[PDB]
Each structure stands twice: as C-alpha cells, then as structure tokens.
C-alpha cells in the first residue's frame with residue numbers, strides 16, 4: 001500500500017480514498033497531483049473559502065453523505081478540471097448556484113436527496129460542459145426553467161421524486177442534446193401542448209407515477225423517442241394519433257392506468273414497437289389497426305368487447321412469438337398459418353364454438369395453446385396434425401363430446417376437465433410424454449392409475 | 462446480529478431488508494446471493510428509488526463501466542467511444 005497522509009488511502013495513479021473517516025474538513029497532507037478525491041460519508045457540514053486550494057487538478061470530487069449544509073461561494077475555486085461532483089445525501093436545501101459557477105469542466109453533477117425546495121434563477125450558468133444532472137428526491141414544486149436553459153450540452157436529466165404538478169410550454173426548450181428525461185414520481189397532473197418542444201434528441205421519457213388524467217399531446221414534439229413510460233397514472237383513453245410524433249418508439253409502458261378505451265389507429269405506424277400489451281380496455285370493440293406496426297414480438301389484448309380477429313394478423317406480423325387474446329368476445333378464428341414464430345397462444349374466456357382443420361396449420365413453433373373456457377363443441381380430427389413441439393394444451397371447460405389425438409403425442413400437459421359430456425377415456429399409448437392430465441371424471445384416470453398426475457378434480461372451478 | 466443499516470438478515474443470504482434510507486445490493490461472486498446495505502450504489506450500478514424499496518440495479522449496457530439508468534451510460538470501458546449514453550467500438 002502506497003504511503004499516504006492519514007486517515008486516507010491512496011492507490012497510486014493519483015486517486016485518494018478518504019471516505020467514512022469522520023472528517024469534518026477537507027483532508028490535508030495529500031499531494032496536489034491528486035486527480036480524484038473521495039471524501040463521502042464523513043461529517044463535513046461546511047465547506048469554507050478555498051477549501052480545495054491545494055487540489056487544482058481534481059477531476060472527480062465525492063462529497064455525498066456528509067450532511068453538508070453550507071458551501072462557501074468560493075469553496076470550489078480553481079477546480080477547472082473537475083468533471084464529476086457528487087453532493088447527494090446532504091442538507092443543501094437550495095442549489096448552491098454561486099459555488100458551482102466556475103466549474104466549467106463539469107460533466108456530472110449529483111444534487112439528489114438534499115431537501116432542495118428552490119433553485120435560484122442563475123443556477124448552472126457557466127456549466128458549459130454539463131452532461132448529466134440529478135435533482136431527484138428533493139422537494140421541487142416546479143421545473144426550473146431558466147436554470148435549465150443554461151445547459152444546451154445536457155444529455156441526462158432527472159427531476160424524479162419531487163413535487164412537480166404541472167409543466168408549462170417550452171419548459172425544456174434549450175435542452176437540444178437531452179437524451180433521457182426522468183419525471184417519474186411527481187404529482188404531474190398537467191402537461192401543456194408544447195411543454196416538450198425543443199427536445200428533438202430525446203430518446204427516453206419517463207413519466208411513471210404521476211397523476212396524468214389525459215394522454216399528453218405534447219409528446220408529439222419528440223421525434224427521437226424510443227422509450228416511453230406513463231405507467232401508474234390516471235389515463236383512461238389513448239386516442240387516435242397519440243404517437244404520430246414518435247415513429248421510432250420501441251417501448252411503451254402504459255400499465256396500471258384506468259385505461260378503458262383506445263383509438264383504433266392509436267398504435268399504427270410504429271415499425272419498431274416490439275410489444276403491445278393492453279389489458280382491461282373494456283370499451284374497445286374493434287381489433288386495433290396495426291398497419292406499419294408489424295414487428296411485435298408479443299401482442300396481448302384482454303378484457304375487451306372485441307369479437308373478431310382480422311385475417312391479416314398472421315400475414316403481416318413477422319416475428320410474433322406470443323399472442324394473448326383471452327377474455328374477449330371472440331367467436332370465429334382466422335387462420336394462424338403465417339405466424340411461424342408463434343409459440344404461445346392464449347384464447348381463454350371467449351365464445352369460440354369450433355376448431356376447424358386449418359385453424360392451427362402453420363404453427364411449427366407452437367408450444368402452448370390455451371382454449372379453455374369457451375363453447376367448443378367440435379374439434380376437427382386433424383386439427384392438430386400439422387403441429388410442431390406442442391407441449392401444453394388446455395381445452396378445459398368447453399363443450400366437447402370427443403377429443404382428437406393426432407399430433408398430440410408430445411404433450412406434457414393436457415387439460416380436459418369441465419367437458420361434462422366428454423365420455424371417451426384416453427389411452428396411455430397415444431400420450432407417452434404426458435406428465436399432467438385433467439379429465440372430467442375419475443374413471444378417465446384409470447389408464448394412468450391402477451384401476452404422471454392425472455386428476456378429475458374440477459379444481460373448484 | 463445484522464450489519465449496520467440492515468433491518469433483517471439471514472445467516473447465509475446477508476441482508477434481506479435494509480433501512481428504508483439505504484439501498485440494497487445483491488452480490489453473487491459465489492455459491493449464492495448475499496444482500497448488503499449501501500447509502501449509495503457503487504459504479505457499475507445505479508441508485509434506484511423503487512416503490513418496494515431503494516435498490517442498487519446493475520448496469521447491463523454493452524461495454525459500459527458506469528451508468529445513469531438502465532439505458533444511458535455515463536462512462537464506457539477504456540478505449541471505447543461514448544455517444545449519447547451508448548458505447549461503441551470506434
């Protein structure tokens with residue numbers, strides 16, 4: 001270990017670690033050649049004038065966790081090479097604008113967790129290099145608009161975990177480089193038409209955990225958006241046109257909203273969207289228009305009044321791996337030939353009354369197929385003939401009187417319980433891979449017993 | 462006897478629940494995961510103030526050394542090119 005002024009440790013290579021040592025002042029006896037100084041988790045409540053006078057070449061300064069309540073206007077004098085400054089978990093109460101004025105090399109400034117309630121209008125002037133700003137977990141009641149206008153180089157900004165309740169037009173207009181913006185866990189109930197104008201480079205917008213009651217038209221001004229979160233809000237409608245401004249959207253988090261309606265074209269023209277999962281939109285009547293949105297890996301539409309699946313779903317979707325259209329009012333089924341990547345299909349809780357031979361023809365990756373809780377009275381004898389690695393088949397609580405075996409010998413799991421008029425018993429030979437079976441009556445387990453968990457138990461359903 | 466800042470521990474899995482003000486980090490260089498409590502997360506992780514508890518979440522960004530969030534890098538591995546929060550061989 002390199003010889004180093006107590007109680008610090010040095011690593012050679014100009015880094016000095018003096019964290020958790022109970023210091024109440026900047027340590028002394030350290031080389032002026034020091035490049036990084038870690039003095040976090042000490043007891044420095046005040047930084048006096050010229051506190052860093054013998055550290056002119058510091059590039060990284062860590063002050064997190066000191067209960068720092070006062071920084072002298074000239075404490076950070078001379079730190080012209082400082083790139084990273086960490087002040088989280090202190091007692092700052094207001095942004096120390098005067099003290100950080102001359103840090104013209106600063107790229108990263110952490111001011112989170114400081115009980116900050118106000119940020120002076122002149123804050124961040126001189127920070128001509130700032131890339132990353134953290135102001136989260138404070139008590140800001142509004143976006144600090146003029147201070148942020150000083151930061152055209154800014155790439156990452158979090159205003160999360162504060163008390164912001166509305167955002168006015170042009171609040172971020174100068175942040176031309178901004179790539180990621182975190183606004184989550186505020187009380188935002190209002191975003192005006194133009195609050196995001198200027199964020200032409202923005203790729204990630206996090207609005208989760210707020211009180212939005214209407215979908216924000218303002219995201220129309222974000223042509224670079226790739227990831228969007230507005231989960232855990234109070235939005236009830238995603239209207240037609242909602243994402244016309246964001247052709248690059250890959251990810252949309254919309255869950256935990258009282259979402260009850262979506263416009264038929266709300267999700268069209270999203271060539272990069274990889275997943276669309278909407279549950280409980282009880283007022284939707286028509287299957288969404290997905291033209292130009294044909295690279296979904298997962299499609300889930302649940303709890304709607306949809307009664308029909310368009311024929312082109314499987315001629316258009318290119319990489320659809322999972323499809324969940326359970327708990328709707330679907331009666332007829334189109335062909336799923338074309339959906340060659342399709343592995344899991346859920347169609348529980350609809351009104352399907354028959355399965356024709358062609359219904360499942362092309363499905364050579366199909367592993368899981370759930371058709372329980374429908375009204376199926378007839379399944380064509382060759383309905384599963386042309387299947388691949390079908391592993392799991394649930395046709396419980398339907399209206400079967402017979403059940404086809406062809407193509408099903410690879411099943412691990414088969415559910416047949418709740419078909420009260422299903423009389424035939426299965427032969428063990430047709431199902432040598434079976435490990436779990438449910439049937440409507442006890443005598444239908446006798447193959448698999450002496451008279452692999454075969455059970456006639458309704459499961460109380 | 463729990464480490465300082467840890468409300469609930471186990472003999473073999475370290476901390477199960479930290480003081481709400483601290484962040485829990487899972488280490489597994491190991492046989493298993495071992496929970497530890499931190500005031501702030503080390504580089505390679507980011508401080509995540511989640512609804513269930515404060516967590517240190519690992520950076521899983523190709524070629525990244527330190528990050529701002531799951532998809533934005535603040536420092537690339539040495540010799541890599543940093544462009545808009547991503548790291549590139551160039």
Ligand SMILES: *[C@@H]1O[C@H](CO)[C@@H](O[C@@H]2O[C@H](CO)[C@@H](O)[C@H](O)[C@H]2NC(C)=O)[C@H](O)[C@H]1NC(C)=O
Pocket residue numbers: 022023024043045
């Ligand atoms: C952390 O905080 C307390 C509360 O102030 C510290 O009080 C300091 O006591 C030392 C020794 O007497 C002085 O050098 C400081 O200047 C005191 N603070 C002030 C601003 O007057 C206490 O010592 C600290 N505890 C630890 C862990 O060192």
Ligand SMILES: *[C@@H]1O[C@H](CO)[C@@H](O)[C@H](O)[C@H]1NC(C)=O
Pocket residue numbers: 149150173174
């Ligand atoms: C930022 O952009 C707006 C609108 O163009 C302009 O009016 C404002 O003065 C600019 N602010 C700075 C500090 O560049």
